[PDB]
Design a protein around this ligand. Structure first.
Ligand SMILES: [Mn+2]
Length: 175
């Protein structure tokens, strides 16, 4: 089926199995908590500026951490979701040799805008209140990194860029 919800379910079930028994950062809740919010950000973003290839991009949102933290291979993503989804997850993976942030963001900035948009949604989601065990320095550093993500990637989707900027501004209160 081409239906947006069927595409999400396929990716969502795959991600739930891949991230089985993985948790959040600074919480015992399932890592799935994170993916639900990123995917929902993406779908919400479409309402403020339509996205080309929305269904695949929503799958990328759901799947964006599979290569970096699960036993998922690129070949599985390609066979089950297509090359565009696979390339999106790869673009969003720093490590599947960890790429430096500058190279990582530059490749997202120069590639398909949908992939950069997923990163904006990822970072918006990660600018919830920091985990209880981060000190001021670590929270401050996360703010700095977020600023670079907005600078390099905000071009991808204006409404989401504005939302990321507001989340970045609001984040300064946590330190
Ligand atoms: Mn993420």
């Amino acid at each position: 089926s081409t239906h947006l919800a069927d595409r999400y379910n396929q990716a969502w079930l795959f991600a739930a199995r891949a991230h089985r028994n993985q948790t959040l950062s600074g919480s015992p809740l399932p890592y799935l908590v994170h993916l639900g919010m990123v995917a929902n950000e993406l779908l919400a973003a479409d309402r403020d500026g339509a996205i080309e290839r929305l269904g695949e991009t929503l799958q990328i949102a759901v799947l964006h951490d599979t290569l970096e933290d699960t036993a998922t291979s690129p070949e599985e993503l390609r066979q089950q979701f297509g090359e565009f989804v696979c390339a999106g997850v790869q673009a969003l993976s720093k490590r599947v040799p960890k790429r430096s942030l500058d190279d990582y963001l530059q490749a997202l900035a120069e590639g398909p805008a949908q992939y950069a948009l997923v990163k904006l949604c990822d970072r918006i989601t990660n600018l919830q209140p920091p985990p209880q065990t981060w000190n001021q320095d670590k929270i401050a550093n996360y703010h700095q990194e977020s600023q670079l993500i907005l600078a390099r990637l905000g071009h991808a989707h204006a409404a989401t860029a504005r939302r990321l900027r507001e989340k970045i501004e609001h984040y300064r209160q946590y330190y």
